[PDB]
């Protein structure tokens, strides 16, 4: 039989990791029922054996960013960005993805800094800007989005420009934007996720700014991809361990398609030790019942 790279997850604690849906630290773990909303984020999606899904890409600093060049909308402070690919090359809308990698995956107004990156002429050319992901002008899959800013002159036409997100005004974590605008349809989405094993609920990796919940920390996406360790079954059994005592706090299923479930009924904001981390223990069959959480 073939001997393949052993699967592992990072040894980073929750607070040492970052949300995969916005460039901010994770703050804590949360579990609760999810039958009343559709959980289909497009960022923070990756299989355990290293296949990226939806709009998921590797770099934490490219999460919810946009890149390209802008054209002034005459008589307004607003600008249309004509998107580039992720390396700054020609955007190619025929790729089978929902949108440019790193595109935001929730409806809301994201504020940030829009900056010209080349041939500044000695000017900073960075300005506060906002992009509304629910707006009719939000058409990243078509290759353009619209920003509101406080200038009408400062951005030179035909010069590379980048948006770095800073925060969200106020928004709907679970509602995907219309990547191609009104009366369109989203295409090539990573699938919705749900707990199908009775007594199980999804485990969310949660930050603030409202809650923002992801299915995998960004560092897990990066680790899974970099390692590309093959899966031995549909479910990897992880233990959350506290090295300060050496004891297991709880166990959970890391599903091969890239999400986590725990045995619990109801909302529970987990209380974890500062140094606790996840440890891969074994691959299990489809009949493994987890030890109860809390
Ligand atoms: Zn102009
Ligand atoms: Zn791309
Ligand atoms: Zn210039
Ligand atoms: Zn300004
Ligand atoms: Zn790693
Ligand atoms: Zn390695
Ligand atoms: Zn599974």
Could you state, in order of their start, the residue ranges of all structural domains in the chain?
1-62+170-294, 63-169
Task: Give the residue ranges of the annotated binding site for Zn(2+).
Answer: 72, 119, 121, 127, 150, 156, 223, 227
- The two most distant CA atoms of the chain are separated, in Å, by 69
Residue indicated by tokens 């036409």: 157
Q: What's the CA-to-centroid distance between 177 and ligand 4, angstroms?
A: 27
Q: How far apart are CA 98 and CA 39, in angstroms?
A: 16
Do the beta carbons of residue 266 and residue 231 sit within 8 Å? no
Q: How far apart are CA 85 and CA 143, in angstroms?
A: 9
Q: How far apart are CA 171 and CA 210, in angstroms?
A: 8
Do the beta carbons of residue 286 and residue 236 sit within 8 Å? no
Do the beta carbons of residue 45 and residue 53 sit within 8 Å? yes
Instruction: Tell me which of 1.20.58.110, 2.40.30.120, 3.40.50.620, 3.40.50.1700 is the CATH number of domain 63-169.
Output: 2.40.30.120
Structure tokens at 5: 């790279």
Q: Which ligand is nearest to the CA of 57?
A: 2
Q: Which ligand is nearest to the CA of 98?
A: 2
Residues in CB range of 185: below 8 A, 6 or more apart: none
The structure was resolved to a resolution in Å of 2.0
How many CB atoms neighbour CB 247 within 10 A?
Answer: 11
What are the backbone angles phi and psi of residue 217, rounded to the nearest 5°? Answer: -60, 155
Q: What's the CA-to-centroid distance between 251 and ligand 5, angstroms?
A: 21
Distances (CA, A) of 135 to 35, 102, 108, 180: 27, 18, 9, 11
The number of C-alpha atoms within 13 Å of 183 and in the hemisphere containing its C-beta is 0
Instruction: Tell me which of 3.30.1330.40, 2.40.510.10, 3.40.50.1010, 3.90.960.10 is the CATH number of domain 1-62+170-294.
Output: 2.40.510.10
Solved how? X-ray
| Nearest alpha carbon to residue 48 among 288, 271, 261, 257 | 257
Ion ligand 4 nearby residues (CB, 5 A)? 127, 150
């Amino acid at each position: 039989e073939s001997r393949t790279k052993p699967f592992t997850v990072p040894i980073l604690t929750v607070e040492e990791m970052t949300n995969s849906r916005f460039p901010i630290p994770l703050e804590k773990l949360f579990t609760g029922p999810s039958s009343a909303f559709v959980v289909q984020p497009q960022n923070g999606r990756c299989t355990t054996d290293g296949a990226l899904l939806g709009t998921t890409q590797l770099s934490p600093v490219d999460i919810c960013t946009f890149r390209g060049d802008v054209t002034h909308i005459a008589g307004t402070q607003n600008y249309t960005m004509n998107l580039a690919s992720q390396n700054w090359n020609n955007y190619d809308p025929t790729e089978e993805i929902p949108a440019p990698l790193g595109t935001p995956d929730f409806v809301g107004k994201i504020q940030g800094v829009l900056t010209q990156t080349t041939r500044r002429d000695g000017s900073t050319r960075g300005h506060k800007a906002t992009v509304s992901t629910g707006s009719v002008h939000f058409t990243p899959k078509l290759g353009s989005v619209q920003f509101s800013t406080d200038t009408s002159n400062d951005f030179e036409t035909g010069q590379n420009t980048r948006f770095t997100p800073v925060g969200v005004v106020q928004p709907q974590q679970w509602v995907l934007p219309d990547y191609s605008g009104r009366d369109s349809h989203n295409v090539h989405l990573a699938p919705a996720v749900a707990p199908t094993f009775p007594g199980e609920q999804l485990l969310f990796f949660r930050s603030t700014m409202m809650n923002l919940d992801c299915l995998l920390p960004q560092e897990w996406v990066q680790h899974f991809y970099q390692e590309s360790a093959p899966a031995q079954s549909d479910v990897a059994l992880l233990r959350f361990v506290n090295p300060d005592t050496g004891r297991v706090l709880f166990e959970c299923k890391l599903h091969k398609s890239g999400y986590v479930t725990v045995a619990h009924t109801g909302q529970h904001d987990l209380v974890i030790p500062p140094n606790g981390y996840f440890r891969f223990d074994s691959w299990v069959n489809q009949f493994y019942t987890l030890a109860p959480m809390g």
